[PDB]
Amino acid sequence: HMIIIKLGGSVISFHRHIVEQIAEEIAQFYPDESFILVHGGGHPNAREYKITEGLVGDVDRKRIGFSKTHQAMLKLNDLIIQTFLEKGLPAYSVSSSSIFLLENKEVVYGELEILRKLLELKFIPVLFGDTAIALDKGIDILSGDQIVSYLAKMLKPSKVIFLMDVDGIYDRNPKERDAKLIEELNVEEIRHLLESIGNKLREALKIAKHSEVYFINGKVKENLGKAIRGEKVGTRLRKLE
Amino acid sequence: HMIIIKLGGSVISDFHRHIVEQIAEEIAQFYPDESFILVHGGGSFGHPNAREYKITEGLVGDVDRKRIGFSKTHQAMLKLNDLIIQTFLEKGLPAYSVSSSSIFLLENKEVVYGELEILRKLLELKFIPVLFGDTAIALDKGIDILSGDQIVSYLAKMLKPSKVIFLMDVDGIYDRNPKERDAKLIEELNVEEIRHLLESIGNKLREALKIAKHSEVYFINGKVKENLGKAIRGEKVGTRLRKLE
Ligand SMILES: Nc1ncnc2c1ncn2[C@@H]1O[C@H](COP(=O)(O)OP(=O)(O)O)[C@@H](O)[C@H]1O
Ligand SMILES: Nc1ncnc2c1ncn2[C@@H]1O[C@H](COP(=O)(O)OP(=O)(O)O)[C@@H](O)[C@H]1O
Numbered sequence: 001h002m003i004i005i006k007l008g009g010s011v012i013s014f015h016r017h018i019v020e021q022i023a024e025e026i027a028q029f030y031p032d033e034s035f036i037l038v039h040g041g042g043h044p045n046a047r048e049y050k051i052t053e054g055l056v057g058d059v060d061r062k063r064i065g066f067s068k069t070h071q072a073m074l075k076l077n078d079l080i081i082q083t084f085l086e087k088g089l090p091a092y093s094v095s096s097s098s099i100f101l102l103e104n105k106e107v108v109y110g111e112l113e114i115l116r117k118l119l120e121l122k123f124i125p126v127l128f129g130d131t132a133i134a135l136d137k138g139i140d141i142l143s144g145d146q147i148v149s150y151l152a153k154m155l156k157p158s159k160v161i162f163l164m165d166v167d168g169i170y171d172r173n174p175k176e177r178d179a180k181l182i183e184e185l186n187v188e189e190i191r192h193l194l195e196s197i198g199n200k201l202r203e204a205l206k207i208a209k210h211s212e213v214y215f216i217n218g219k220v221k222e223n224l225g226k227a228i229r230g231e232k233v234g235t236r237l238r239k240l241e
Numbered sequence: 242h243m244i245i246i247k248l249g250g251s252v253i254s255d256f257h258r259h260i261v262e263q264i265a266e267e268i269a270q271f272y273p274d275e276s277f278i279l280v281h282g283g284g285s286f287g288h289p290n291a292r293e294y295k296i297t298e299g300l301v302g303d304v305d306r307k308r309i310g311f312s313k314t315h316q317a318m319l320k321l322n323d324l325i326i327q328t329f330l331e332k333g334l335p336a337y338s339v340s341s342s343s344i345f346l347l348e349n350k351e352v353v354y355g356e357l358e359i360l361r362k363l364l365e366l367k368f369i370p371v372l373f374g375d376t377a378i379a380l381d382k383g384i385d386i387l388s389g390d391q392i393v394s395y396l397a398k399m400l401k402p403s404k405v406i407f408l409m410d411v412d413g414i415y416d417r418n419p420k421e422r423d424a425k426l427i428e429e430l431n432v433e434e435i436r437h438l439l440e441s442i443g444n445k446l447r448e449a450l451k452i453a454k455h456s457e458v459y460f461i462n463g464k465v466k467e468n469l470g471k472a473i474r475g476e477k478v479g480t481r482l483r484k485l486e
């Protein structure tokens with residue numbers, strides 16, 4: 001009984017009111033429910049220093065920007081952590097680039113014993129999309145979707161909840177005209193959509209092999225509780241069989 | 242051919258940006274031909290929160306308040322870590338933060354579980370990882386305070402550095418409390434003297450005994466710049482504890 005919740009980069013950006021709403025919803029299940037939290041950037045230094053290119057060209061500048069981008073990520077992570085703390089929840093920050101190693105944007109080495117111990121002692125670990133050491137490229141950007149995929153394979157949570165700007169995975173483009181919400185997502189529908197973001201839809205296809213997946217609107221407070229309890233909300237991709 | 246520098250808690254803070262710039266300049270005199278790990282203690286940041294929430298008592302009594310204070314102490318340590326790293330970055334050195342509580346587990350104040358591959362890759366790619374004394378999960382009492390001395394001890398037995406350099410408020414180890422008007426600095430430390438001093442701080446001397454099995458140890462004054470380079474070059478400075486045999 002453990003639930004991973006991924007906060008998109010756009011729902012938290014700082015949007016303290018929505019973080020307070022997520023914390024109040026999580027408080028309805030703590031501590032009779034283990035929770036892991038992952039959030040994203042809200043990004044400037046990563047593009048400015050070309051982290052995804054790797055350790056090539058001006059390597060000294062890339063190492064400085066690698067650290068600067070990590071320090072910025074820690075500052076935003078602190079904003080989220082403090083908000084959770086004044087709401088009574090023991091959120092504890094875990095540095096992603098301290099426990100993960102990348103190859104081809106994917107985690108190929110991980111340390112998970114501290115996360116396990118944090119959950120066992122009724123803590124709420126909070127990771128973030130981060131800069132990360134890459135075996136193939138020296139340095140790379142580890143996205144939140146990759147952390148969630150690796151955690152899903154290893155810790156096998158009961159479900160993974162994506163908080164997005166829209167109500168879920170839509171038929172056409174969400175901000176279009178005649179777009180319908182896919183309340184029940186199956187794998188063939190996912191492959192239907194990937195031919196015509198697709199990155200997290202691919203990660204969702206991987207995660208579904210291990211856990212139930214929800215795509216919900218993180219701006220509506222009650223959606224998080226509806227997804228945690230299993231009620232109808234947004235888009236739901238059941239565990240594969 | 243790797244050096245572990247420990248930055249005493251009352252050296253870097255009680256924040257002294259000037260001496261941190263001094264340590265950065267000294268280190269930049271040897272980077273990148275030499276690889277460094279830095280461990281800094283809680284200055285005026287981590288202690289006022291740890292003793293306020295009594296982290297060393299473990300997960301006992303008001304466990305909910307201790308969990309909050311556990312987190313608040315880690316966040317303050319991360320703020321101090323950011324000041325030290327930003328200072329190192331502006332000096333052109335690629336310092337990178339490693340969260341101690343993300344990779345270590347404690348029991349009886351000692352690390353009994355650790356992850357060191359990310360540290361290894363950081364050193365391999367010419368980064369300077371910066372760890373800190375931190376709150377930590379303890380297998381016996383739930384939560385505890387992981388001292389930078391114990392971090393360096395675990396890193397010494399594991400990575401076997403060429404030397405370990407403690408930056409302190411004093412010139413090194415003395416015959417007694419340096420506050421006494423008659424107190425002399427020990428230039429060459431040995432196990433007999435360490436046991437002599439311990440029978441009457443002490444934690445740093447016990448860890449130094451364990452560390453000396455794998456690395457040569459230096460105790461120097463961290464507020465005098467040229468002292469660090471002297472210890473890195475193996476010159477005569479402060480107190481030296483040679484590798485055991
Ligand atoms: N068919 C679709 N269904 C839902 N959202 C879509 C679709 N096509 C494009 N999008 C948009 O793609 C974006 C992906 O969000 P993204 O920035 O990847 O989240 P994160 O911050 O977690 O990386 C969403 O904001 C959404 O508006
Ligand atoms: N024989 C001795 N040699 C050196 N320092 C001593 C001795 N006896 C007592 N001390 C004192 O113990 C202190 C050790 O500080 P310490 O607790 O190691 O700092 P931190 O915990 O921040 O690393 C020194 O400031 C020094 O004044």
Ligand SMILES: O=P(O)(O)OCC=C1CCCC1
Nearest residue numbers: 040041043046129130143144
């Ligand atoms: O969770 P996301 O948004 O997929 O990845 C996180 C993105 C960044 C960019 C700089 C540091 C972290």
Ligand SMILES: O=P(O)(O)OCC=C1CCCC1
Nearest residue numbers: 250282283287291374375389
């Ligand atoms: O690193 P030091 O000074 O040896 O040990 C003390 C460390 C901390 C970190 C949070 C509270 C106290």
